[PDB]
Amino acid sequence: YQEPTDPKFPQQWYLSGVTQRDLNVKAAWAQGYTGHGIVVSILDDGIEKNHPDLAGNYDPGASFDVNDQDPDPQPRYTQMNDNRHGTRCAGEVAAVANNGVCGVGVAYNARIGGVRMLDGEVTDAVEARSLGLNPNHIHIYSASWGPEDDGKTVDGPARLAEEAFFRGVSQGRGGLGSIFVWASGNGGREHDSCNCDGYTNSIYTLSISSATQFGNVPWYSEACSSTLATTYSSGNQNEKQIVTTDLRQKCTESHTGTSASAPLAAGIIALTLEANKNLTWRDMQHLVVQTSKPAHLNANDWATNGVGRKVSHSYGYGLLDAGAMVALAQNWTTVAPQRKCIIDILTEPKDIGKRLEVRKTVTACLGEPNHITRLEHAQARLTLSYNRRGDLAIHLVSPMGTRSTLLAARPHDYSADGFNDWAFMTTHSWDEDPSGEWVLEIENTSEANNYGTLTKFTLVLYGTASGSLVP
Ligand SMILES: CC(=O)NC[C@H]1CC[N@H+](Cc2cc(Oc3ccc(N4CC[NH+](CCC(=O)[O-])CC4)nc3)nc(-c3cc(Cl)cc(Cl)c3)c2)CC1
Ligand SMILES: *[C@@H]1O[C@H](CO)[C@@H](O)[C@H](O)[C@H]1NC(C)=O
Ligand SMILES: [Ca+2]
Ligand SMILES: [Ca+2]
Ligand SMILES: [Ca+2]
Ligand SMILES: [Cl-]
Ligand code: NA
Ligand code: NA
Ligand code: NA
Ligand code: NA
Numbered sequence: 527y528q529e530p531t532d533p534k535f536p537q538q539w540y541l542s543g544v545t546q547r548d549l550n551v552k553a554a555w556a557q558g559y560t561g562h563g564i565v566v567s568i569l570d571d572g573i574e575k576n577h578p579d580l581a582g583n584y585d586p587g588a589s590f591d592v593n594d595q596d597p598d599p600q601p602r603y604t605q606m607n608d609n610r611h612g613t614r615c616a617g618e619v620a621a622v623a624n625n626g627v628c629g630v631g632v633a634y635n636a637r638i639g640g641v642r643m644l645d646g647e648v649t650d651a652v653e654a655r656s657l658g659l660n661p662n663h664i665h666i667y668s669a670s671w672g673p674e675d676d677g678k679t680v681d682g683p684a685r686l687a688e689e690a691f692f693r694g695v696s697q698g699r700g701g702l703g704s705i706f707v708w709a710s711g712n713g714g715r716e717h718d719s720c721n722c723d724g725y726t727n728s729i730y731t732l733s734i735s736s737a738t739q740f741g742n743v744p745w746y747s748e749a750c751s752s753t754l755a756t757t758y759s760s761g762n763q764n765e766k767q768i769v770t771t772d773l774r775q776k777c778t779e780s781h782t783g784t785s786a787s788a789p790l791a792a793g794i795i796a797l798t799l800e801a802n803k804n805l806t807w808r809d810m811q812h813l814v815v816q817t818s819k820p821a822h823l824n825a826n827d828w829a830t831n832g833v834g835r836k837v838s839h840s841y842g843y844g845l846l847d848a849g850a851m852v853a854l855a856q857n858w859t860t861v862a863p864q865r866k867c868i869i870d871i872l873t874e875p876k877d878i879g880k881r882l883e884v885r886k887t888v889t890a891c892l893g894e895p896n897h898i899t900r901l902e903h904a905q906a907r908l909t910l911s912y913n914r915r916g917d918l919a920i921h922l923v924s925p926m927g928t929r930s931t932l933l934a935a936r937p938h939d940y941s942a943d944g945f946n947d948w949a950f951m952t953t954h955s956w957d958e959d960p961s962g963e964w965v966l967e968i969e970n971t972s973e974a975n976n977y978g979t980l981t982k983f984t985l986v987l988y989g990t991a992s993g994s995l996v997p
Contacts, residue, residue: 527556534629534777537769539739540758540790541632547739547822549757549790551632553849554797561633563803564796566619568789569656569669570612572601573640577613579621579628579771580638587663588639592655593646601773602645610773612640614781615670617771618789619796628777629769632793632848633800639664644671654686657706661698665799668792670709670785672725675748677716677938678916680948682724691730695807703807705795706731709788711748719934720750721950727752729903729951729988732811734791735841736784739765741822746783749827749839751922751930751952754811755818756841757790759783794848802855808902809861815956816995817851820844832926832958834997839931842953862990867891867898871966871983878912878978884966890987892961898989901960905951905986906932910968911944912978919969924955925962935971944978949986957994960987 529535529552535542541551567588575584575598589599601609620631620638631638641656657667673681683691691706698704708731710720720726726733733753738744738761745761760767760782768781768790798813799805805813820828820836823845828838837843871886891897906922916939920932930952964985970976 530623530630532623532625532627532629534769537779538629539766547741549794549845550847550849551794554852557849557852559797559800559852561620561636561793561796561800564633564636564666564799565664566633566636566638566666566668566792566796567659567664568612568615568619568640569643569667570615570640571609571644572599572612572642573616574601574613574773574775575599577771577775579625580616582622582625583620583636583638585637585639587660588637589641590659591642592652593642599640599642601642607773609645611785613773614770614778615668615789616640618768618786619668619793621771628771632790633796636796650684650686653683654690657687657690657694661694661704662700664704665699666705666707666792666795668707668789669725670788672711672723675711675713675716675718677713677718677936678940680722680945682727691728695730702804705807705810707788707792707795708733709784710735710750710753712746712783712785713748714744714746717937718748719936720748721752721932727949727951732791732814734788736787737823737841737845738762742824743840747840749931749934751839751932751954753839753842754953755791755814755843756823756845757787759787791846794846794851797848798851798855801852802858804860805855805858806860808864809858812861813851813854813858814846815843817847817854818843818845819847829928831928831954832924837954859993862992864988865896865898865990867896867987869985871985872980875979875981878910878968878980880970882968882980884983885963887963888961888985890961897991898987899959899961899991900994901955901958901987901989903951903953903988904955904960905949906966907947907949907984907986908945908980909947909982910978910980913942913976914974915939915941915944917970917972917974917976919971920950921967922952923965924958925960925964926955926958928955928958930954947982
């Protein structure tokens, strides 16, 4: 195998490293996987389809302009170099290799397109038309953004966008399911807590956070239980950044944020789908859980779950490992159909006050076709009132003892609107048996005399009852 000759490939340290601080992509390329036959779309502010490092891989069938209602996602050029972000992300996935220009994509033989959706008013219809673009042609969608990362917003897909997620995972990709890759957010300096973003908090999105070059949690990272894994991105000014294609037929060495991590994950997922085109949207999440690597990622919250895997709210299961992903994909056995076990927990509404603990022992639908002995995602769908939402911290403990933070205190969230059936999601109990005692903790983290009531707690378990591996 011959590594790329592109002039900036040596600067793509997260691919080209010799010292084990990388995504192990060369190992996948050397197994023969480069993304050939896979189609990825960047949901962002447009794509410069004529960029010298994108044109050779550009796919009009992966592209649309939902802001101006036309097929051509070319960016709107301005003095301030607005509308460059989609082009940067596209190159991360699929910049052409061995052509003397910039660097390379993770999946440098994949086809790449973009949806111009963020350069205008983003409505539910705009989102649904983007997530639902050409779902039997596009395999993987990469989205780096969502509701405002101000540390005070709780929002997620409205009805059309949610319907687009379920149509995508159910009928998309010939019934195997569209793969939606999401960035978990850039709200770290606002103390944002990413389960409050319903896009990354969705089970249907494969959510990705960031690590800096020296293996630390970047300033912009949001912690939450819904994240599944990590890719490298930017950090402090002594740490390198992401090197990729830029608007106006240029390169950049200064692409940054969690919004630069999701495209790298989308590229790795593209290599993995080349290795086994029959993988379902759930299979892909299983592969990420099993192959991601905590080693050398620094966080104070690494915890071992009930099946012996280390998990963090900053990093999920750790750094994606492309060589391991493609290797495990090749002989992967499709997971069993997805079951869903619904447990309405409360017998009466519960005053929250300073602290509330709710304990319930469940059988996880014993005796039913939705009996789950092998969990995937779990949700605590909560309906509660509270006088100052951001003073709440919420945790969920599984029968195996795994303590998932569903919500951390958000100092800027002054809302008095509470949570209206908000489906807080955790990936940290993946592969555990969910039968037994679950514990929900709601705490007022402030010294103020705050008040409210929990009126509904639905525990929703997804998973199967077959196929488990030794812890
Ligand atoms: C009841 C109802 O009907 N409720 C409609 C709401 C539902 C919630 N939704 C949240 C949402 C806002 C948003 O708003 C934006 C707008 C602009 C940006 N930008 C533009 C500038 N960029 C500069 C970067 C740089 O230059 O480096 C940064 C990002 N981000 C988020 N997007 C998304 C979103 C993003 C992607 Cl990707 C894919 C999908 Cl599906 C949805 C979602 C808004 C409509
Ligand atoms: C894909 O997986 C399904 C489910 O296991 C199986 O029925 C089908 O034969 C597989 N198709 C290919 C082409 O491997
Ligand atoms: Ca256009
Ligand atoms: Ca190149
Ligand atoms: Ca956020
Ligand atoms: Cl469902
Ligand atoms: Na965000
Ligand atoms: Na997700
Ligand atoms: Na444990
Ligand atoms: Na149990």
